[PDB]
Amino acid sequence: GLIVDTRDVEERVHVMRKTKLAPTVAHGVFNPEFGPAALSNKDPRLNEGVVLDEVIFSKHKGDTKMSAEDKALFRRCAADYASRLHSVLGTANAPLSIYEAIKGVDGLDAMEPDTAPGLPWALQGKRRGALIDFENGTVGPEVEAALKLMEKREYKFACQTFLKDEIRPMEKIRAGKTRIVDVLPVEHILYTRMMIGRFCAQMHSNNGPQIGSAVGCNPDVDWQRFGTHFAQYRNVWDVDYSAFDANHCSDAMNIMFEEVFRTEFGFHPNAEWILKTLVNTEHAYENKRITVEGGMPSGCSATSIINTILNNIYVLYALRRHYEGVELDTYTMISYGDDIVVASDYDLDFEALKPHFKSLGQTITPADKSDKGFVLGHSITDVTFLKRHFHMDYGTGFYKPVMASKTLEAILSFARRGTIQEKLISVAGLAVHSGPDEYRRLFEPFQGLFEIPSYRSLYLRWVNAVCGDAAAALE
Ligand SMILES: [Mn+2]
């Protein structure tokens, strides 16, 4: 995005600044090239003469401005993708009730308590539970005040910038490339789910290539569905972006909101409005008041979906801007926010597309980062998606989501105090696809210390999960 105003205020919005991630016994055994993010300017492990607060905002390199022709083209791609999208999902996008927005529906999880509620409930020492009733599905005084202020299209807000306390590669840590979360007010989040929560629900349960979205998928069972789809195509590309979230330009955002969330598709008129309030935002990080034009706030509750929608339009736009007669069936794809797999029987040159993507302020890059650029002939078994490869299971003949063993080591090395046991069982479900020998090795350090699920129990669980027929095809 484009920063238009840095300014200082003495009501400090303080951030966290040390990690919750204590090492585990796995740490000493594996010695991973990973560790907690850098949360303090004083962090020893940070390269000398690097201040945490500046590199944070180096992602805002400008808000790309598009020509009248490129905008008309983008609008067509947005309208075409929107056409596909609503054709699959239907047009029953009437506002969710407050109860339904709090508690969720089929396809949409309930809103969370115990997480941040944003501003200025941080400035009033007010906690999520104090504003809304999560079991009752009801709201309090000022949030209802703020609710019917957004009806009236007035709503003053700022984003609260947090530092993401997470495991990162040791280099990102010495470089101080700590990721950030923009926590919006809880009234913003719930209203957004009132405006578009029914649509998001439909997206989740209809995830797949046809809508180009994996948001709400279950990789354990859906890898078979996705893998077999992309195996049918002659070319498969693993496309990476540089700072996808931050580089959504004002023109692309506004136009996608205008084309996707129209009232003719059964949205309330305020769906477009509430989404449009994410374009020019207000970030109370570090020295509080920083104003940004362009880019998507990293974290809203519809971020994954919005980043997915834009990703789908970006690809259509880039291809149409280089080739002629490019339509939605010219290629296939699936994405999850910035993460994307593309495939086609056409021999599309993603190296030539680079500038066309750059007209949107987006920089595409091959996943390898080697060769010299995008090559052809790659298949579904060469790519990473949701940090998972596609591999064939020997026993079933299904695709399984395999994670890099060194990534699993990193995840197994650090954990919050008192959660290790739960985290192991959780991570066991991920590691089971790495095969029995590597599974045994990854969980060696916890032998006789924590309960470790047997490889066989999770394999049988997974087999039935992929489809009961396979599990029943035995015995
Ligand atoms: Mn990727």
Residue numbers in the entry: 1 to 475
Question: How did the manuscript describe this experimental structure?
Answer:
Here, we describe the selection, isolation and characterization of a FMDV mutant with substitution V173I in the F motif of 3D which is able to survive the mutagenic activity of FU. V173I does not produce direct resistance to the inhibition of FMDV replication by FU, but compensates for the increase of A → G and U → C transitions that the wild-type (wt) virus endures in the presence of FU. The structural modifications associated with the altered nucleotide incorporation have been examined by comparing the three-dimensional structures of the wt and mutant polymerases by X-ray crystallography. The complementary virological, enzymological, structural, and computational results presented here support the conclusion that the V173I substitution in 3D restores a required mutational balance, opening new perspectives on the role of mutational biases in viral and cellular evolution.
To investigate the structural modifications associated with the changes in nucleotide affinity, 3D(V173I) was crystallized and solved in two different crystal forms at 2.6 Å (P41212 crystals) and 2.4 Å (P3221 crystals) resolution, respectively. The superimpositions of all 476 amino acids of the two enzymes showed root mean square deviation (rmsd) values of 0.33 Å and 0.62 Å for space groups P41212 and P3221, respectively. Despite overall structural similarity, some significant changes were noted in the polymerase N-terminus (residues 14–18), and loop β9-α11 (residues 293–302, at the N-terminal side of polymerase motif B). In both space groups, the electron density indicates high flexibility around residues H14–K18 and this region could not be traced in the trigonal P3221 crystals. Two types of changes were observed in loop β9-α11 depending on the crystal type. While in the trigonal crystals the G299–S301 stretch was disordered and not visible in the electron density, the tetragonal crystals showed a 2.5 Å movement of G299 to S301 from their standard position in the wt enzyme, packed against the fingers, to a configuration where the loop protrudes towards the catalytic cavity in an orientation that would disturb the binding of the RNA template. Thus, localized structural changes are associated with altered nucleotide incorporation tendencies of 3D(V173I). Thus, the parameters of presteady state kinetics suggest that substitution V173I attenuates the mutagenic activity of FU by forcing recognition of the cognate nucleotide.
